[PDB]
Amino acid sequence: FTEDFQGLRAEVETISKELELLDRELCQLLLEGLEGVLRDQLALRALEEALEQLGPVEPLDGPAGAVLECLVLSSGMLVPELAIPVVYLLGALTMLSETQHKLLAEALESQTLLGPLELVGSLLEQSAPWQERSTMSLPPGLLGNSWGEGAPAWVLLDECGLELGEDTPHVCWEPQAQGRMCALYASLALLSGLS
Amino acid sequence: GNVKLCSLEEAQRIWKQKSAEIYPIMDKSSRTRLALIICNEEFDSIPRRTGAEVDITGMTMLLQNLGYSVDVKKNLTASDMTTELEAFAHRPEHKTSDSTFLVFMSHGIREGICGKKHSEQVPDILQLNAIFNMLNTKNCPSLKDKPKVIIIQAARGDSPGVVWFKD
Amino acid sequence: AIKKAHIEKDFIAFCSSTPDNVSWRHPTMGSVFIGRLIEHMQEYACSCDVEEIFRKVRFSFEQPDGRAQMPTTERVTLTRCFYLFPGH
């Protein structure tokens, strides 16, 4: 496809559009599982090794088993119609730091995904092309009350590679933050579709 | 009450004749059935349904005599009825129920059911399949394998629906 | 343990009239469709299933009197017979 943000948006939403095969009951169970997985460095690696991008997977313990018990048949066989959307989510979580993983668990818990979901989305579309350093500035329409040092929307962008500012042009886009910003948007977009 | 209740002699007779082809009825001592009635009476640009209150009382009494808790919402738009339907689709008491009844009473055209803000220029229509996929197994797993009776009182066109033939 | 299931089944719709035709109501005694439905439901819910009760309501409208209306059963995905058990 395209290397733009609209080419990433179509790449991501094709994983969400057919994720409607997940029921409302399973969506909240997968959400309660991914919340505990994002709080454990070990459970995320244990879950990712179990999925492994044929054979039945053994049941796990803790939050890792909570997610895996939402994606297997009675015999333990992985359903490829639903396991691949999840392994695309984890493929976007390996590119994120553990600090961002915890702040996603706070967003999943207090129902605050839509806060920085569009903020990252608007920053990824106005920063085209990704190959150049550009001095941007978020509008007051995207938050502006939460903004500040140590804020959830601040730490999620600082851990990507962006040099943030409280005043002036608030955000400075660096091309090295491209990989983590696309993964941070993919994580927030897929989790919002599951919500 | 007004419903001629089924005798236990006959209730046993029907379940004995075709047990594997009847939806299982839960016990009255612990079931929590639900029924939703959405009736739009007065409209902002369409003639008011004069006398639509007797239909609300009649259906509510009928559903209560069958063992259903009736929730009635009046005068809503196509988007306002969607908020009350999805809130009705993940109610907690549906997992301890065995059936449900949905009654829709408003104006309507060939497309679907009209809302409060419905006009000729700007529609306000809640189509039929919008109601169906909103309480399907996906958005409402608590009613999987359970009867979902939807009753619709609304016009569907403008023709009288008659034809004259030789007698 | 996750199983596969049909996206929608066990549905049944009972419309007020046939397509392209109008329903009919009375400001004093309510609608003719709502009134006739309550009569048969209060009468045949102890012996007939819902799909057969709706068929009996259509039978009472076989003779067009006044504003002819013919109720229609649409989008039937009932796998079993829905028997209401009044009193149980």
Curated annotation (Swiss-Prot), chain A:
Effect of F1 to A/R: Constitutively active mutant; promotes activation of pyroptosis
Residue ranges that the Swiss-Prot or TrEMBL entry lists as coiled coil: none
Modified residues annotated as S-(2-succinyl)cysteine in this record: C27, C182
Record-marked site positions (Cleavage): L8, R9
Location of this chain's protein in the cell: Cytoplasm, Cytosol
Region annotation (Linker helix loop) ranges: 1-14
Protein name per its UniProtKB record: Gasdermin-D, C-terminal
Organism: Homo sapiens
Swiss-Prot record, chain C:
Domain of life: Eukaryota
Known partners and oligomeric status: Heterotetramer that consists of two anti-parallel arranged heterodimers, each one formed by a 20 kDa (Caspase-1 subunit p20) and a 10 kDa (Caspase-1 subunit p10) subunit.
Protein name: Caspase-1 subunit p10
Organism of this sequence: Homo sapiens (Human)
Section of the entire sequence shown: 317 to 404 of 404
